[PDB]
Amino acid sequence: PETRPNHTIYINNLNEKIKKDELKKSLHAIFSRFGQILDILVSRSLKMRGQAFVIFKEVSSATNALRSMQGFPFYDKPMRIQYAKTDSDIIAKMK
RNA sequence: UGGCCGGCAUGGUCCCAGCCUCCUCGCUGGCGCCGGCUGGGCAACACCAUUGCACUCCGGUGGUGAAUGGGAC
């Protein structure tokens, strides 16, 4: 069951051998052109590794970034993108 | 040596270079042989497992079971 459009895009299948700080940076490097990015959450834990939440200011940006970067080779692996199941707190604190 | 002990072997103190290492990366650390016990930590590094939807940091195991020569007194 697919997901509905969201301010945040959920990315996975990311190279797990990359340190958190570097990954967030590199991610911003290739995603900031789709629109303002409020934040990028990355965790290296057993349950959260290989994934990331890029939180865009405007849903259109998440949408664009989703369609444009699906399958993009990143750190030797094809990035897999989706909309986040629910809203990130940073977003709730507003809309 | 991370912390502790035994056996053996071994002239000494320096100086240059090279190499070594999870546990004060370096010139007022170390770089003979052998055996036993044992602490911490995944921070880095490695290996294993993981395709996982968060907004609470948080899987496991491994390494020292290491590294040579030369020069002056």
Domains and CATH numbers, chain A: 1-95 (3.30.70.330)
Rounded distance between C-alpha atoms, residue A34 and residue A19, angstroms: 24
Separation in Å: B72 C1' and A89 CA: 72
Nucleotides of B under 7 A from a protein CB: 44-46, 49-55, 57-59
Tokens of A89: 């707190």
Rg (CA), chain A: 12
Resolution in A: 2.7
Where are any strands of DSSP class E within chain A? 8-12, 37-41, 51-56, 73-74, 77-78, 80-83
Give the phi and the psi of residue A17 in degrees, each rounded to 5.
-80, 5
- CA A60 centroid distance within chain: 14
